[PDB]
Design a protein around this ligand. Structure first.
Ligand SMILES: O=c1ccn([C@@H]2O[C@H](COP(=O)(O)OP(=O)(O)O)[C@@H](O)[C@H]2O)c(=O)[nH]1
Ligand SMILES: O=c1ccn([C@@H]2O[C@H](COP(=O)(O)OP(=O)(O)O)[C@@H](O)[C@H]2O)c(=O)[nH]1
Ligand SMILES: [Cl-]
Ligand SMILES: [Cl-]
Ligand SMILES: [Cl-]
Ligand SMILES: [Cl-]
Ligand SMILES: [Cl-]
Ligand SMILES: [Cl-]
Ligand SMILES: [Cl-]
Ligand SMILES: [Cl-]
Lengths: 301, 301
């Protein structure tokens, strides 16, 4: 709703940009591992047909397994290429959507994969890393768990990249956040695929379907716990991708639907038509908080 | 709101794409002029510092003046370059914002300019043409008035271009229209600057400020008169511009604010911050329908 007390100039000077945003993180792995204090860490890579890149992402994380990282899992989203074998050969455990949660038939989309990974993991902290990254850096996981392990009251950490500009992020997500959740425009890259959260938080929020999942988690965390529970950390440089605009438009439509559902805005539910005459669909139905399925699964949560 | 009766596939097949959309218009100037039947046509070019292009746009329209076109006006938006003299030298009448409506102090933005041009024009039909066009074609005005003069019940005509993809249009405007006014996704280029409307319609709707003006007029026309009152016509090929993403993000923010204000969505009113640390503002206040100022102006409407 209307927030005439907040201005853009205020947001550009927001204290959160100082206390909860790390542009030059300097935590070491050894000190992060010393700070775990009994918490365990699960790293989850969603993967749909990523045979060319998945092993490279896994190998940047695998030296952490058994130390900082307790579980390293690729959640296979129905791949028909060599994603599974290559992830295994790079040192990851691979779990299909069906094995993660056999009682429920899989739905398409990235949100489904991350939701199911809650049932397949045990860590008190869960780190998500995209498996299509061409140039992953081995400090991703340590930087993402830094605020969870050391800072107090942080439950969600968003990893951002410096440019050497994501169009949906800059034109869709951040301007709609300015309109609907203006404090969240402090987050540099709200749609980022590299982020970490505590299990308590992630088990208690719905998961948006498809490409809505990241923005849904960000807004639900903000609504439930406030901006101070969210942090962001610089992962380094990333050469920004060059995805087709038509893919981006269908993705923007789902981002809009998920943000509208979190913000009380009545979305029509109608998919996006594009003309050259092509259509895509949108989902208005989340997966409920995984906590709701507690007690009813063959594998305990 | 929720429209579970409409699907994207429906929209891709919509009868409106047949009866109200002209991909290959073949009207001649002589037959359009014969169909005026006492109506007059005003052509209005908003111009803020367009010295390099304004004369070229004017010259493509000027041979129509005294025949199909009754008035040809450049509405100078406070230019400090040679826009005014060059428009005059190309054959247009140039009117400042102050002279268009002296009783009211000018506000910044394109919407203000077009709103004020209602008070400066007399045509029963008003055609808007951007003055920054590098390659205007002399058939623009005839194609835009075709449906107004020949078809029945059309009050707004949107000119679109074939590509040899506008990012705000494809990622922001059309997906938000899919969510909030799904029938309007039939319109290929809702943010287009080349369009025509009847005076009765344009005098009776508010004008959104700044870059919200085109989408505000489209949604208000749709809400007031329905989709059949809107038409679109192919103006030909246009080499799409290459504006900076940062300009596009500020523009997207205002498009969002204007669409939200028309659709009952509570916009926060907060401007957009962008980080590299830059801010832009957004307006939630329209100019009221010009009909409301009737009787109170020194120049009668
Ligand atoms: O149904 C899906 C869609 C995406 N992804 C994964 O989620 C990440 C982000 O998807 P994106 O579409 O950006 O990747 P792409 O294959 O297009 O490069 C990638 O690791 C995908 O493999 C997935 O596991 N399941
Ligand atoms: O306050 C304004 C802003 C824009 N325009 C005009 O509206 C059109 C669209 O503006 P845009 O910003 O796309 O043009 P630019 O100068 O950026 O090429 C152009 O003819 C501008 O000269 C205007 O008259 N007043
Ligand atoms: Cl491999
Ligand atoms: Cl599926
Ligand atoms: Cl993006
Ligand atoms: Cl919680
Ligand atoms: Cl000139
Ligand atoms: Cl001004
Ligand atoms: Cl555009
Ligand atoms: Cl009317």
């Amino acid at each position: 709703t209307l927030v005439p007390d907040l201005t853009a100039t205020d947001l550009a000077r927001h204290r959160w940009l100082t206390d909860n945003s790390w542009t030059r993180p300097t935590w070491t792995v050894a000190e992060l591992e010393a700070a775990k204090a009994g918490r365990t860490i699960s790293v989850v890579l969603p993967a749909l047909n990523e045979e060319e890149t998945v092993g490279g992402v896994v190998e940047t994380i695998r030296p952490l397994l058994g130390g900082l990282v307790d579980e390293l899992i690729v959640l296979d989203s129905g791949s028909t290429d060599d994603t599974e074998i290559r992830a295994m050969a790079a040192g990851a455990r691979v779990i299909s959507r069906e094995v993660a949660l056999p009682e429920v038939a899989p739905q398409p989309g990235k949100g489904e994969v991350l939701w199911r990974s809650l049932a397949a993991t045990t860590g008190d902290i869960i780190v998500f890393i995209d498996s299509d990254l061409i140039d992953p850096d081995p400090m991703f996981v340590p930087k993402l768990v830094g605020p969870l392990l050391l800072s107090e009251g942080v439950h969600l950490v968003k990893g951002f990249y410096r440019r050497p500009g994501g169009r949906v992020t800059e034109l869709v997500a951040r301007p709609l956040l300015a309109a609907l959740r203006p404090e969240l425009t402090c987050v540099l890259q709200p749609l980022g695929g590299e982020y970490a959260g505590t299990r308590e938080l992630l088990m208690s929020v719905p998961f948006a379907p498809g490409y809505g999942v990241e923005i849904g988690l960000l807004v639900d965390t903000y609504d439930r716990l406030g901006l101070d529970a969210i942090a962001q950390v610089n992962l380094g440089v990333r050469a920004h991708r060059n995805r087709p605009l038509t893919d981006l438009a269908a993705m923007s439509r789902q981002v809009i639907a998920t943000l509208f559902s979190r913000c009380g805005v009545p979305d029509s539910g109608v998919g996006l038509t594009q003309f050259f005459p092509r259509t895509s669909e949108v989902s208005l139905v989340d997966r409920p908080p995984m906590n709701t399925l507690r007690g009813k699964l063959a594998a305990a949560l």
